Amino acid sequence: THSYDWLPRLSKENFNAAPVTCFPHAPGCEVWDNLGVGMKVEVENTDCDSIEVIQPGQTPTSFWVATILEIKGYKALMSYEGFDTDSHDFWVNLCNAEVHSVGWCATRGKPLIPPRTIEHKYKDWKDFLVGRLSGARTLPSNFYNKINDSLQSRFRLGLNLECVDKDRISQVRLATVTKIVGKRLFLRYFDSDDGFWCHEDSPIIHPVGWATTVGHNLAAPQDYLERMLAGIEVHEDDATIELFKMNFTFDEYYSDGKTNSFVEGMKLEAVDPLNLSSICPATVMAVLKFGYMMIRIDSYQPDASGSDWFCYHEKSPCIFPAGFCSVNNISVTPPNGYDSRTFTWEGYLRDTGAVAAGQHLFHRIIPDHGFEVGMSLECADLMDPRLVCVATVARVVGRLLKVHFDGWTDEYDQWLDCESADIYPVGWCVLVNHKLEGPPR
């Protein structure tokens, strides 16, 4: 099946796409404000043939000037100067297409060529172009240098890192970077041909020596396991700490990493790491070092092995104080044994004799992320992260988003932070050459 083209959606009235500036990790986000509706650019002339003389060895492409009418994610609606109607307006992918600052062609000694449809309007287009372009906005000359510098991943193939075992989430397992697409890494577990996709900014991948330092469960080859126990000796293929994104510093804590914030037994809410459509009561099972802690989803069946425990850092945007769902009108997943109609936090804390973790332990500042209900975007299927799909913002709960996959039932909706690295602007797949899943037939 083919990758889904946004084209028919773009060609509809009131189509709403989240702007690139909503996605901090997205390429071009930093310089995107240098773009604007009404700006003028040199763009490829598709409506002309061998009018321009091209010497052998030169690129056989001709350019004309256009105005950007609309911007939807990476998509821009172009309109050639000289046209009276919108008959030849066309959509482009901004960071794929040959779009340039006005004056780019002249630097290469190339002339601008009027499209055939309007070429007759003038013998010399100087007066028209001077009249249309004087005082107008165009692209900064360094624009695409900035874009290209934002395409490269911080990682490369062959790097070894510790990442969560999808078959046993209570431990991290040694894995190697074998594929990179648009900064989404494929990590193949050592001594196996299985693995998973995740963005380079994912909180479930960690540098070499992380598990040992933090105190997380670790599965790895013997030689690696024994190398960790000493300390600490380095290796050429070790993924180091500066490659990894954190919203905190190891210096915030002491050198020993002793933390006394979250405590074992404390109750809270959290997104089910095995079901991103669900938010349910959770319990701190073990406090590790440097803010990391193992928690248990209370909706799970009884399990003393602690194999289904999951590590969240205390500054994670995916853990919430008790009462988060009820306060925001979210249907909470009842803890095992309880019913939807028979569950309250007050009664639940009574029966377990437990204490809910205080609001002060949570760090959830709410930015004006700019996300709105109805906005379209591209979102990774967190259940099958090899897939990136057509998606819509269904709800906005402070800084938490409910993301709906267009064409599917609301049961597949996933909870994602506004600054998650699993959501992307419209046109991202085209830019990075990832396949986009469209709505089911």
Partner: peptide, 30 residues
């Protein structure tokens, strides 16, 4: 945006056609 808020510059641009060359005064962010 610019010129209201952030940084912007005037930029003189060179344009060629098959009838001649000329200059236009435009602007861009940064």
């Amino acid at each position: 945006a610019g010129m209201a808020s952030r940084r912007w510059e005037q930029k003189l641009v060179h344009i060629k056609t098959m009838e001649g060359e000329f200059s236009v005064t435009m602007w861009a962010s940064g």
